[PDB]
C-alpha cells in the first residue's frame, strides 16, 4: 500500500540519478545482485554524537559490498553529482526530489529543523527476487549508520544467493 | 494574493539561510538599504547558450550592489552553505525548501526535467518601503541573468533613496 517490512517484496520505483539517468529498482535487481538502499536526510550535512559533530562520513565503506548501492535523498541530481564527485563515491546517488520513494518506503521526517519531508536515515537490502532481506531505520537523523555492518550483511545475503 | 508586480508592495517572508538563521524580508528592509531577491533553479547546476554549457557563474558580481542580496532556491541550507563556501559568496543564500516563497512570488517551474516545483530564474529589487522597484523573470532556466545590469539598477535605486 505504501509500507515496506522484512520478508515482504520491495516496491518498484524509478528515480533520476546524479546524471539524470532514470534508475529503476527492478531493472537494477535483474542485473543479478542484491540492492542496498541507503536513505539519508541531506548531502553536505554533518554526523553527530553527544556534542561532537563532524564531516567524517564513512559512506564509501559501502563500495566494499557485493551489491548495487543506491543512496537516496530529496536533494537534486545536480547537488548529488557534486556530493558524489567530492566524496569520490563509486555508487549511484538517486534524487527523490518529488518525495515519492520516501512516501513509498515510509522513511521520512514530516518536519526536520523546519524542513518538510526530509528522508530518514534508513537501509534496506533487497534480494534479486524483490524480497526485503534486511531493514534498519532511525528516528535520529545525525546518528550515522554502521556501514561496515551493512557491508557484512550485504555480503552474507550475496553469498547465500550463490550457494 | 500570491502575485508580485512592478510598483506594488513586496510580500513578507521568513526563510532559513545557509546557517539555519531565520531571515525575514521586512526585517532586512528595516536595515535601510534595498533588497535584491535572486531566485535560481539549483545550486551546482550549469548555465548554457546555443550548445556551450559552463559553470562560469557571475553571481558574485552582485556583491558590488549597494543592496542586501538574498539568493533563493529550493535547495537545503546545508547544500546552500557548501555552494556559498565554494563560490566564496558574500551574500546570504536562503532555502525555500517548502516552496512557500516561490509560490508567493509566482516564480516557479511546475516540472523542470522531471523535478517538480523548482524556482525560476528571477530578480526583484525591493525598496526599504516594501515597494517593488525592478522585476525580471525568464521561462528558460539555463539563461543566466545580466548581473552587471542588476548591480547598475540596484545602485540607481539605492542612490535615489539617499538623494
Automatic annotation (TrEMBL), chains A, B:
GO MF annotation: an example: peroxidase activity
UniProtKB keywords: Oxidoreductase, Peroxidase, Redox-active center
Cystine bridges: 48-53
Name by which UniProt lists this protein: Thiol peroxidase
Signal peptide: none
Pfam families listed in its UniProt record: AhpC-TSA
Residue numbers annotated as active site: 48
UniProt xrefs under PROSITE patterns: THIOREDOXIN_2 (PS51352)
InterPro entries associated with the record: AhpC/TSA, Peroxiredoxin_AhpC-typ, Thioredoxin-like_sf, Thioredoxin_domain, Tpx_Peroxidase_subfamily
Domain Thioredoxin: 4-159
Amino acid at each position: 500500500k505504501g509500507l515496506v517490512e522484512l520478508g515482504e517484496k520491495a516496491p518498484d520505483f524509478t528515480l533520476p540519478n546524479q546524471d539524470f539517468e532514470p534508475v529503476n529498482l527492478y531493472e537494477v535487481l535483474k542485473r543479478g545482485r542484491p540492492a542496498v538502499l541507503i536513505f539519508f536526510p541531506a548531502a553536505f550535512s554533518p554526523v553527530c554524537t553527544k556534542e561532537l559533530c563532524t564531516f567524517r562520513d564513512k559512506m564509501a565503506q559501502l563500495e566494499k559490498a557485493n551489491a548495487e548501492v543506491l543512496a537516496i535523498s530529496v536533494d537534486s541530481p545536480w547537488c548529488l553529482k557534486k556530493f558524489k564527485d567530492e566524496n569520490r563515491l563509486a555508487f549511484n546517488l538517486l534524487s527523490d526530489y518529488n518525495r515519492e520513494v520516501i512516501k513509498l518506503y515510509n522513511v521520512y521526517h514530516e518536519d526536520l529543523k523546519g524542513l518538510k519531508m526530509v528522508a530518514k536515515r534508513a537501509v534496506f537490502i533487497v534480494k534479486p527476487d524483490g524480497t526485503v532481506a534486511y531493514k534498519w531505520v532511525t528516528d535520529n537523523p545525525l546518528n550515522e549508520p554502521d556501514y561496515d555492518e551493512v557491508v557484512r550483511e550485504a555480503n552474507k545475503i550475496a553469498g547465500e544467493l550463490v550457494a
